[PDB]
Symmetry: C2
Subunit: 308 residues, 2 copies
Amino acid sequence: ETARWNTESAALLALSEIHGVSYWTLYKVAQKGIRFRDIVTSQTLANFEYLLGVKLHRQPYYLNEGNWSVFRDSMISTAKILLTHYHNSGYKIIHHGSPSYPDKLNDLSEPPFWLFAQGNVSLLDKKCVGVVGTRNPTALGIYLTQAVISQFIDSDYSTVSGLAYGIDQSAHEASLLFKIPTIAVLGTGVNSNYPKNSGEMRGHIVNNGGLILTEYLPNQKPSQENFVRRNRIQAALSDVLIPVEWGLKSGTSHTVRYAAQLKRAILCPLLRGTTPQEEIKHALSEYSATIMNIPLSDFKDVQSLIKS
Amino acid sequence: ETARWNTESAALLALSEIHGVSYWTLYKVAQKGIRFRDIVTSQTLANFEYLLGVKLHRQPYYLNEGNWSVFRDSMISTAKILLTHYHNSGYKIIHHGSPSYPDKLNDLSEPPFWLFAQGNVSLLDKKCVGVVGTRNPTALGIYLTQAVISQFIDSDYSTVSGLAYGIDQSAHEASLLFKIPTIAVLGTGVNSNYPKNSGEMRGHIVNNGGLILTEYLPNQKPSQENFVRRNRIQAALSDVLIPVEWGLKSGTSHTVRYAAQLKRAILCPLLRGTTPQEEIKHALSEYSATIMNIPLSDFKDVQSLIKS
Ligand SMILES: [Cl-]
Ligand SMILES: [Cl-]
């Protein structure tokens, strides 16, 4: 069974890394039920380009009948070693339709048809709580992030965030601090160094039983489109979504909307004694969200301790 | 009534700032019930030095009968303006035996006989929770400090700490963030810039209804002896003492010991699922301390919200 998916893995890397096929091109290929293995084993360039869904080239073209066999065989041979190269770094490619693929992602209209993974894949199949927010939080947003995640200590939950500046990085840092496994869904390929000084955090995430996850091909750069596209994954994986600090018509609003479309539970942190803002009121109105008081405790619980 | 204490204030400043009398010398003076006003109005140097408790000088000495009147009158005149100078900066001098002096400090064997104050003095008479710890905390100590103080939101408590690097600064920063009035007890005189970038925090403390407090004379530098001496104040003011992160045979252990001697309530933060350390076990053994779980909430309270 292993060898079937490894052949599809190598075909994906062949088209992506060697021939440079776009994410979108390969996505709609897989969306149609076309397997990359049968694209790379095409015996003509016409067949190649038909299955790949691009505009067929006329003559003259540098790819032709005279050099097709080597073009095909050399790319298959190249990609087979390239996958062992990525396996050696601890990366796994999880394909849609395989046993390792998590059910939750098939709630999406556009499920990822492949995933690059580094770390503990079994977390995708277990309870997850998304913690996400602005890349430019206030001091209180940073605290609420940690306070929220501390509530899940010794639960069966892991955390999910996007490894981005601000709330997301504070979410991962908090999960690590409290020894909650955390999942980072990237807006890049696995090879990128974004965000700054990310290689150590990714290391600690993996060392603490966490997971690095991305739908994007190894060398895909960060982009505003890549982030919004990735947030459908974050919403789908989040059994509960907790947007800590966020404005409407923001990145995180997309995630919250998606979570509402996916009928995920939505909790909104509110510090004791403070007034909900319209983004919170929006979530209670639209998405049937729920306030989560921080602290959840009352001061009466503190009084019990002081005066025994 | 105001003018009686202002005269004692000016006499204290006269001896301290003009003539350079030590903290300890003036402390034992006041400990005996000698008022500084009557020292500065002494008509001989023999009387001056007898009341001040120092070794009486023989002749020849530059202070003598021929220049005594001016020495006395010029220092009284100088100090009267010097107090208006400190009043203008918002400083108040609170004397032991005056209505503004807080009762809690008379639980000390060695109560401060004067206090310099900037901000809201009425906090000393109300519920206070001390939050103190090492100057070199771990990441978790910094969080626990904030989590502990968040429990007192919308309580009638203010916070008390020593405005020192580490836990103390995180305690003040947390109180400010959650809008809990905070009291900083200095290990210096009010004129010092210690610790680094302290003038803005002192400003925000005062602007948020907080208080700066010190027993030390205006230009007293920081010292390890000044810090341990000041922690008897912090213990006395703390109706509840919460040492967040601390080793035994540390600065903060002195405070905790004192708090035990003063029979203050002692709470010790313990993150959920973690084992008490011997410093915590020491406090439960000796000082009848109590664990305060962080969070105080259970995960069952989170489950209630998720699945309504
Ligand atoms: Cl596929
Ligand atoms: Cl006095």
